[PDB]
Amino acid sequence: VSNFLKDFLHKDRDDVNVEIVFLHNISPNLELEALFKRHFTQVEFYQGSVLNPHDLARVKIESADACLILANKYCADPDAEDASNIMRVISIKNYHPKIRIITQMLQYHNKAHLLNIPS
Amino acid sequence: ELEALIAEENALRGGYSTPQTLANRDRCRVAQLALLDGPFADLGDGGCYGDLFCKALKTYNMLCFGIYRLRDAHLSTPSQCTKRYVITNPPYEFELVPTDLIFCLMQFD
Amino acid sequence: TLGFFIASDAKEVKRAFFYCKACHDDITDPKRIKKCGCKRSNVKKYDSTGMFHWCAPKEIEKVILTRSEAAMTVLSGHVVVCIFGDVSSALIGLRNLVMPLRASNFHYHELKHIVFVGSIEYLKREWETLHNFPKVSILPGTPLSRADLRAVNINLCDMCVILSANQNNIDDTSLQDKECILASLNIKS
Amino acid sequence: AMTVLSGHVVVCIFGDVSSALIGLRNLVMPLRASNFHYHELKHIVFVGSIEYLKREWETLHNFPKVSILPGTPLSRADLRAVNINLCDMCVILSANQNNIDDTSLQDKECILASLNIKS
């Protein structure tokens, strides 16, 4: 998150009126508390999955410019987090089929599963 | 008894065939019949479920069991979907359409 | 004796033994029905019970087949079964799928041919419970690999079963089912 | 199943390869104790994983009459083939005492076997 927040909420942007809403089931440690306290006016964290559509109803996913799904740089199996992010794309497009999603993958042969979805 | 016979060695062994054996494979299987090539192609459209029940049971002893109706059948405009839903125990009021795949329990000839 | 009835209510089936020719010959209304007015050639074909198709116990190298080998034989009408099973993954008991699909209430030509698709090094760990049934096949591939499904004649095929062998590993809850949903969509595309 | 060997003593073992040692040798020594005549002896048939008994057989390989049956004590056909009905006391010993789930569940295999033999 830090690099993404450093190169997203940067001083030299034009007209940033956009409030980042993180949504993740694991509660953060103290370092992320210190990081979210630094960006108080732009960042809101929430706890919960992106598979329960009630949790998507809490973050107002129905109306948002876009939803970005991040991915870990490392893992035991890349087909774990690849297919998990494909699952998250399936869920978010199942809720509201007119949203832009900018995701991440870890392989190239797992990215063909995103053309699988008709939405 | 077959739970016991599988319980003896954790395997499904077998042997020869008797007139007791081939008399045991007369159970009633589960199947799904069309409404085009069948006998009741006349009863295919506008036939009530009850008449199909009786004319199937009194002729073939096939227990009519449910109607597997196509989803975009009650709609007026022709769609292209082939997903069909399941209706269990239809009463006399239930109008039949010719493009169904009626669930029935079939006997063994 | 007992009868097993499909109804809509328990009072509909309380009716079901209140019957007499005299008391209830000519009543067509169910509410009217409910009156307690009664005054009162030695080839091994089947198994020992004779209820399942039983062939001879064969070797697993017979019913193994490559991608191009199944691509040669057109085998329409069949039933494929996908398995996401690793070697360390827990058992499923695929035998209980083959028994009621080889149930001897069907004729021998009437049967549906089963082709499993998955890791051969999983199916060898369960094949000692399935090695008695007449026609069956193994495809040593991956259900996500689309070329095996092209070679398995999925388009000209009966319902294809997707079963997740590795239910054992559980990440979150829904993520446990990720492989099955991912496969089904891939088959649809 | 060919050789009828009545009077014998079977010993069941629930031993996996990774499971800890038992020391079955200390069962065979006082049952081969030279206070008995050679015809007077009780023949021991172990029943269990051969890939466990190979890990302890280097301590038992000196004794006159002994046998291994590579099966499972829960598998009833091996007990039919081991002539359990025409046999002396049958010993059930749980090799995998190492894995311990709860407390009683550790002893589940032994109780399950004994009941199966009784049926």
Q: Are C141 and C148 in contact (CB under 8 A)?
A: yes
SS3 of D39, please?
Answer: coil
The radius of gyration of chain C from alpha carbons, rounded to an integer in Å, stands at 24
Tell me the C-alpha distance between A50 and C172, whole Å: 11
If one counts every other C-beta atom within 10 angstroms of the C-beta of residue A78, the result is 16
What are the CA-CA distances from residue A13 to residues A4, A7, A9, A36 (Å)? 14, 10, 8, 20
Structure token digits, residue A55: 């949790």
Whether the CB-CB separation of A117 and C185 falls below 8 Å is answered with yes
Under 8 Å between Cβ of B15 and C45 = no
User: Is the Cα torsion angle D51, D55, D57, D58 positive or negative in sign?
Assistant: positive
Tokens in use for D52? Answer: 């466990």
Which residue in this structure is represented by tokens 């192609």? B41
Listed in sequence order, the residues at least 6 apart from A84 whose beta carbon sits closer than 8 Å to its beta carbon are C171, C175, C178
Provide the 10 A C-beta neighbour count for residue B33. Answer: 20
Nearest one of C69, C72, C134 to C107, comparing CA atoms: C134
Q: What is the DSSP letter of A27?
A: P
- Amino acid code (one letter) for D50: I
Beta bridge partners of A43: A20
Asked if D75 and D112 touch (Cβ cutoff 8 Å), the reply is no
The two three-digit tokens of residue A112, written as one number: 């063909």
Q: Is D56 helix (H, G, I), strand (E, B) or coil?
A: coil
Q: Which residues contact A9 (CB under 8 A, 6 or more apart)?
A: A16, A20, A39, A42, A43
User: Two tokens at D35?
Assistant: 């206070």
The whole-angstrom separation of Cα A91 and Cα A64 is 15
Ordered strands of the B63-67 beta sheet: B29-32, B103-106, B63-67, B87-88
Q: Which residues of C have a CB under 8 Å from any CB of A?
A: 171-175, 178-179, 181-182, 185-186, 188-189
Whole-number Å distance between alpha carbons of B56 and C187: 37
Pick the residue of A25, A54, A56, A84 with the most C CBs within 10 A to test the interface with C by mutation: A84
Judged by CB atoms closer than 8 Å, whether chains meet at B22 and C129 is answered as no
**What distance in Å separates residue D1's CA from the closest CA in chain B?**
14
Task: Give the angle C173-B83-B97 at the CA atoms, nearest 5°.
Answer: 145
Strand B63-67 to B87-88 pairing: antiparallel
Instruction: Verify whether the Cβ–Cβ distance C178 to A87 is below 8 Å.
Output: yes
Q: What span, in angstroms and rounded, lies between the C-alpha atoms of B84 and B68? A: 6
- Please tell me the distance from the alpha carbon of residue A52 to that of residue A46, in angstroms, as a whole number: 13
Q: Which residues contact C128 (CB under 8 A, 6 or more apart)?
A: none
Task: Determine the Cα–Cα distance for residues A3 and A9; give it in Å rounded to an integer.
Answer: 10
Q: What is the 3-state secondary structure (H, E, C) of chain C?
A: CCCCCCCCCHHHHHHHHCCCCCCCCCCCCHHHHCCCCCCCCCCCCECCCCCCECCCCCCCCCCECCHHHHHHCCCCCCEEEEECCCCCCCCCCCHHHHHHHCCCCCCCCCCCCEEEEECHHHHCCCHHHCCCCCCEEEEECCCCCHHHHHHCCCCCCCCCEEECCCCCCCCCCHHHHHHHHHHHHHHHC
Residue B105 identity (one-letter amino acid): L
In DSSP notation, B9-48 reads HSS-------TTTTTT----EEEE--SSSSTTSSTTTT-B
| D87 close to D8: Cβ distance less than 8 angstroms | yes
Residue C178 is which amino acid?
A: K
The answer, for B86 touching chain C at a CB cutoff of 8 Å, is no
d(CA C8, CA C174): 35
* Contact between residue A92 and residue A68 where contact means Cβ atoms under 8 Å apart: no
Say if residues A19 and A64 touch (Cβ distance below 8 Å). no
Cβ-in-10-Å burial (0-12, 13-18, 19+) of B12 comes to buried
Answer whether D88's CB lies under 8 Å from D9's CB.
Answer: yes
| Residue D33 CA: distances (Å) to CA of D27, D66, D92 | 10, 14, 21
d(CA C137, CA C149): 14
**Cα atoms found within 13 Å of the Cα of residue C137, Cβ hemisphere only:** 18
Least Cα separation, residue B79 to chain C (angstroms): 18
Residues that constitute the known binding site of A for Mg(2+): 19, 42, 44
Q: Name all contacts of A32-38 with Cβ < 8 Å and 24+ positions apart.
A: A32/A1, A35/A1, A35/A2, A35/A5
Crossing angle, helix A78-95 and helix C178-188, to 10 degrees?
A: 70
DSSP state of B95: B
Q: How far is CA C102 from CA A48, C48, C58, in A?
A: 46, 15, 16
Contacts of B58 (CB under 8 A, 6+ apart): none
Q: How far is CA D60 from the centre of its chain?
A: 13
What does the alpha-carbon distance between residue C103 and residue A100 come to, in Å, rounded to a whole number? Answer: 51
Q: How far is it, in rounded angstroms, from Cα C154 to Cα A19?
A: 47
SS3 D33: coil
C-alpha distances in Å from residue B102, one per residue of B36, B65, B105, C40: 12, 7, 10, 41
Other residues' Cβ atoms within 10 Å of the Cβ of residue A20 = 16
R_g over Cα of chain D: 14
CA dihedral A39, A43, A44, A48 (to 10 degrees): -110
Q: Are strands D66-70 and D9-13 parallel, antiparallel or unpaired?
A: unpaired
> Which of chain B's residues have a Cβ under 8 Å away from the Cβ of D84?
none
**Is-contact D31 D44, C-beta < 8 A?**
yes
Q: Kindly report the CA angle at D84 between D79 and D90, in degrees rounded to 5?
A: 100
Number of other CB atoms surrounding residue D33 within 10 Å? 9
Give me the residue label for tokens 């035998």: C95
Helix (H, G, I), strand (E, B) or coil at A112: helix
3-state secondary structure C61-80: CCCECCHHHHHHCCCCCCEE
Question: How close does chain C come to B88, measured CA to CA in Å?
Answer: 9
Please say whether the beta carbons of D42 and D31 come within 8 A: yes
Task: Please give the Cα distance from C25 to C19 (Å, whole number).
Answer: 8
Q: Are strands B29-32 and B103-106 parallel, antiparallel or unpaired?
A: antiparallel
Do the beta carbons of residue D81 and residue D8 sit within 8 Å?
no
Chain-centre distance for alpha carbon B101 = 8
Which CA distances in Å does A103 have to A68, A87, C172, C184? 6, 11, 20, 21
Q: Indicate contact of D with A: 3+ CB pairs under 8 A.
A: no
β-partners of residue D13 are D93
Separation between Cα atoms, residue C186 and residue D29, nearest integer Å: 64
Q: Which position has the token pair 């295919």?
A: B44
The two beta strands, D9-13 and D91-93, are parallel
CA distance C133 to chain B (A): 10
Query: Is D79 exposed, middle or buried, given 0-12, 13-18 or 19+ CB atoms closer than 10 A?
Result: buried
B23: contact with D, CB 8 A cutoff: no
Query: Regarding beta strands C114-118 and D44-48, do their DSSP bridges make them parallel or antiparallel, or are they unpaired?
Result: unpaired
Closest-CA residue to C140 (of C151, C129, C155, C128): C151
What tokens does C133 get?
């049934």
Cβ separation A116–C178 shorter than 8 A: no
φ, ψ of residue B22 to 5 degrees: the values are -70, -15
Strand, coil or helix: D95:
coil
How far apart, in whole angstroms, are the C-alpha atoms of residue A89 and residue A92? 5
Number of Cβ atoms within 10 Å of the Cβ of B16: 12
Q: Which amino acid is at C134?
A: P
Residues 6+ apart with CB under 8 A from D55: D17, D21
- Contact (CB, 8 A) for C45 and B17: yes
Distance CA B74, CA C77 (A): 30
DSSP-assigned letter for residue A28: P
